[PDB]
Every structure is written in structure tokens, then in C-alpha cells.
Design a protein around this nucleic acid. Structure first.
Lengths: 338, 310
RNA sequence: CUGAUAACUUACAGGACGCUUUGGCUUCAUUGCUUUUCAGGUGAACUGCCGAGUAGGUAG
């Protein structure tokens, strides 16, 4: 197992989220940020605490009232704007059927068999309804939904032949899973992701457009550059009409529409689907190779999971919930080679 | 204690204080300032922002947002101090509720403390704040020089028992929110000096400005209007005045810092006495000398908090 | 107070004739940088007059 050259190409390909300001004239301009320098006070722990005593008289009372400057990128909604409009395009494809490189046709046919068995027995509706719920509730705006009056999402699917799928105010209406399952906006766009994951050479391109009603001079929070190492908080930016504008990133909004993993030892909230179920806030990673629930301890028993998908009936504790994680990692994956 | 990764996110999100000049015709124009650059014979830029002649009055507009981002820490690192702080917050909420901090945070929003020096040589200034979510009219205030002065003047019938709740139910309830749209009308005299916020100039009086309708207007800061409504701290050894709720309690105009770790009242001697302050809030009775005064500061600093690392 | 004391190496010069380096080529899988911020004109360079004046001059 793990045959020294095993790679997968991803199945969900998002794009950058371009911010626009729409005025009461119903005309659009690119949202522009600026780099302002501000005077903070010395509030860091280890400017007046070595470990963990008290320092010499270099941290005196007169020397802790010396305001330290930062130069940070500030972006806000301009005065007299109607609302903010955020646009990106996501594409669901069928690149999880066959591995990209396999090296040995004993584990290749195993993985193609395993995906076909998962397709037939417990279908794509679970992962489709989870992946599409993170697009249609404005999860890819990350923090711009906190302290916003109301935000609406209009998405244009393809191939489509009808009206634009529109989810109105997504705080009162579309809270839980059952709110999403109404007539013209669920039955027909969950199918076309099932027929884009299960059908060979399948494709489903959605163009998503969200309208944010923020308060007066409200702070807009885009994605920041890494700064391979004064200037902390430098925003990622691209040029629209000869004006630089903040972008929110391509890879950040892939890590938004793929926060679905709540199948991990206990359960609290969805994590980003990794191998070692890493949590960002609580810096400790769950699904560690000790507990034996990581992707590599699961995939080593892939040939076991076919024996359970023979006939009636597969139990929904560590067969369905672990295969969900297996398929959720094949959709993202590359590469398991070692 | 201090587990090498303990950051919080701010609860109170203020916005830029946009100036507008209103005329006798009842139309609003952006306020404009000139820049006198000196050109010595063979850059020194000095700005002046005065109210123009024949103007009826001035209008200052900003939007403040009370959120519920003080319950859970942003990055905790260890799950031993996590339940400590969360327990300490809910015990504080249970024993001595958010009414006091809510009042202290709303009093210096509803009396024009965020204008800083525009209240100086001002006849009258009226504040109209629109809260959200709300079901009625605009909560409007009268002349704030004679009417609203002490705590008891603010505690009138239809304008205090309804907007302290929605701040109390913001800090308590998970993903709780309260967005106040504040508009203040300054009745300044003929050619009165308006004092906005100035830029750093790392090395004389260049103003901080943004573009409205294609012309530059002064702004009165984004952080100069959050550092005004968070002038609460008067729980430091003796008592003089409301300070900025900092870690080491730094006074700005006077250069020294009261509440300094030699005294042992800063937000590191108090944060490391958490295990004590869960024991004290168990049963009757908590004294208002060195417990409630410390817990108030602890929570006042947890609202501003980030980032506590060492 | 020196292997001490003393010391002219110099004239002249033609490297030239000739030259094909060439054939072929897939770098490609996966990706959250984020948390928090006061730059500070003490009152102070005024009030008039002439001028059609966002021009230009003037007294105190």
C-alpha cells in the first residue's frame, strides 16, 4: 500500500472573490484600500515580562507610555454606497474516479472499485448537500457576514435552462439544512453535482454573486499576504480597470466551501478536510496518527472497506462516516506517495 | 499561565466619523480643508479646517457594532486555560451581569465623547442614534450640556431600559449583534475651529482625510473614535479620571502609566489570578474593593483583547 | 666594524598557409497567514476702507 507514486487531481476548482461597491445610481466601482500608519501602545506581554518575573528598569513607567507605530492596510465601504457586491466562479468536475499517477495497477483498480462501490451504495447526495450548503449561505465571505444587516446570494449554474437560483436574506430564512430543501433551488442543483461526480467527463460551473448590506463606513476584511520573513496586515490585491482592489484569495475560498468534516472522533463543528484533521483556532490537531482516524490509517484498510459494501447492510458509525472522510480527501487530494 | 498563543477578537467595531456641513437651504455638503505649504526662499505642510461662513450647523456620522467575540478565545493553544476563561466569563455573567460595562460603554457614545475637542466652544450638540434590530422610531437626544450630565439623567423612560438590553443580550447570546447608527448635530459658532485626527509623520499638523463625492474631507480617525468610547477604567489604586482600558493602563497626555506591574494591578498579575477569581465568584459575598473592580477591568480588557501570547 | 674592502653584459631579428560540429525531447500533482492599536494646533495672525471682483490695493 502507498505505492511510492500515487497522486490525485482535485475535483472542486474555485476562483478569486472580486469586491465591487454599488452606488444609489446603480453603477459599480472596484473597492479600493489604503495603507495608513497608526500609533499603538506597548500592550505585548514580553515588553515588560522576561519569563516570568519582572525585568530591569528598561520597562519603566515613562518607557511603557511610548506609543509604538504600525503601518497596516485599512479597507472600508465608502460613504454614500448602496451595498458591496462579491463575485466568484466554482467548477465541480469528475477527477476523483481515476488517480492522476498510480505506478502499480493493483492499488489503482482498488481505488476505482472503492469509488464505484461508494457511488452505488451511499450516493453523492450527502457530500453534494454539504459542499453546496457552504456556497449558498455566504461561508466564503468568512468574516464580512459578522456585523452585516442582510446578505443575499444569486448563483448562475451551467449547464442550466431556466431562472437564476436566488437565496434571499440568509440569517432569518436559510439557517438550518431543512430551510435549503425548498422547491426550485435544491432538487435540481444537487443533481448536476451528483451527475458531475458520478458521470465520466462530467462538469458543473456555478457563477456565485453575493450582495452585502454593511453599516456606515463598515470595515471590509479581505485575505492577507504571508510576508516570508514595519508592515503586518498587507492585503492580497489584483488590478480592476487600473485600480488595485482586495481579492479574498482563490485558496481561502476553497478552504471555505470544504469545511464539512464533522465525522471526527467526538464532534463539535465542521473542520477543513485535511489528512490529520488539523484545527486552526485550537492549535492541537484532532484525527492524529495515534487515534488511527487520519487519512493514511484509513486508506491502508481501503481493501477492507469493499468487503463491507458486498450486500445488506453497512453500519453508519465507522463505515459510512470514515468512507465520507476517504471520499472527501480523494475530492481534494494529491499526493499520498511517501 | 500565558500559553504561548492566546489571541482574542474585538467586540466593539467602530467606523470613521464622516463630517458634513448643512446650510439654511437644508442640503448637506462635505467639509473641505486647505493646506499651507511654506516655500522658503533661496515638506512643511500645515492644514486648517474651519466651518465655512453662512453654514447652519455641522453633522458628524459614524456606525458602532457591539458583537459577541469575548466568549471563546481566537487561538487558545491549550484546552486547560480555555474552559478557565469561558467559565470565568459565564460566572461573571451569572454573578454580576453586563449592565455596568454596557452603561459605561453607552454613556460615552450618547454624550459625544467621540468628538474629543469639537464640544469645546459649542452652543448645543444633539445625538440621534438608530439601533438594530429595532421596531419603532429613532432614539433622539436633546441639548447634551444642561439635560444629560450624570448617570440618572440618561436613565429616562423610553431611551435607556431598551438600548442597554440588546447590548446585554449581545455580550450574553452566542453570535449576538447590536449595530448603532449614531448621527450628532454640532451647533458651532461662525468660523469655529474643527479638530480632526492627524497622520503619524515618522521623522507639522497634516490631517487624516478620505474622499467623499470626489473631494477630500477630514475623518476624526477610525481608532481615535474607538479609543474615546473605551475611556472607562477608574478602578486603579486610588482614582483620578477615566483612562483607556489598556494592559498597563497607559495615560496619553500625561506620559506615565498608572496600573503598572510594580503595583501589581495590570492585566498579567490579574489574568494569572484567574483560578482565585473563579473561587471568589462561587458563593456570597464578593466585595467592591479589589474583586468586582478587578473583574470589571478583566472583562473590559477581554473585550479589547488580542493578543496575550508570550 | 657585515664570505669585509673594488665592480656597466651588449649588439640584430616577419610564424604563417587551410577548415560546416549535428540529429531527438511533456515537469506536475495539493495549499486559510491571522489576532490588538489616540500623533499631539491650550486661548492664539485681528477689525476696517477702496474696488463689478474667489483680480488687485490699502490703514491701523
Amino acid at each position: 500500500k502507498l505505492p511510492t507514486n500515487l497522486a490525485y487531481e482535485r475535483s472542486i476548482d474555485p476562483s478569486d472573490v472580486c469586491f465591487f461597491v454599488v452606488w444609489p445610481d446603480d453603477r459599480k466601482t472596484p473597492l479600493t484600500y489604503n495603507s495608513r500608519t497608526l500609533l499603538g501602545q506597548m500592550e505585548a506581554k514580553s515588553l515588560a515580562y522576561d519569563v516570568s518575573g519582572q525585568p530591569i528598569k528598561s520597562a519603566t513607567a515613562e518607557a511603557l507610555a511610548q506609543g509604538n507605530p504600525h503601518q497596516v492596510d485599512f479597507c472600508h465601504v465608502p460613504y454614500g454606497a448602496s451595498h458591496i457586491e462579491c463575485s466568484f466562479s466554482v467548477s465541480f468536475s469528475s477527477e476523483l474516479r481515476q488517480p492522476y499517477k498510480c505506478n502499480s495497477s493493483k492499488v489503482k483498480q482498488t481505488l476505482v472499485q472503492l469509488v464505484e462501490l461508494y457511488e452505488t451504495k451511499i450516493g453523492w447526495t450527502e457530500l453534494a448537500t454539504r459542499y453546496l450548503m457552504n456556497i449558498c449561505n455566504g461561508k466564503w465571505l468568512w468574516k464580512n457576514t459578522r456585523k452585516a444587516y442582510c446578505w443575499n446570494i444569486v448563483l448562475t449554474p451551467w449547464p442550466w435552462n431556466g431562472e437564476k437560483v436566488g437565496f434571499e436574506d440568509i440569517r432569518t430564512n436559510y439557517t438550518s439544512r431543512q430551510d435549503f430543501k425548498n422547491n426550485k433551488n435544491w432538487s435540481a442543483i444537487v443533481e448536476m453535482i451528483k451527475t458531475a461526480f458520478s458521470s465520466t467527463d462530467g462538469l458543473a460551473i456555478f457563477e456565485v454573486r453575493a450582495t452585502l448590506h454593511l453599516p456606515t463606513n463598515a470595515m471590509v476584511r479581505p485575505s492577507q499576504v504571508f510576508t516570508e520573513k514595519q508592515n503586518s496586515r498587507v492585503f492580497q490585491s489584483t488590478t480592476i480597470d487600473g485600480e488595485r482592489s482586495p481579492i479574498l484569495g482563490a485558496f481561502k475560498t476553497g478552504a471555505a466551501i470544504a469545511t464539512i468534516d464533522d465525522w471526527y472522533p467526538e464532534a463539535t463543528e465542521p473542520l477543513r478536510v485535511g489528512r490529520f484533521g488539523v484545527h486552526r483556532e485550537d492549535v492541537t490537531c484532532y484525527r492524529h496518527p495515534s487515534t488511527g482516524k487520519d487519512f493514511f490509517s484509513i486508506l491502508q484498510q481501503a481493501e477492507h472497506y469493499i468487503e463491507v459494501l458486498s450486500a445488506n447492510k453497512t453500519p453508519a458509525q465507522e463505515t459510512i462516516n470514515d468512507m465520507h472522510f476517504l471520499m472527501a480527501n480523494l475530492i481534494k487530494g494529491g499526493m499520498f506517495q511517501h
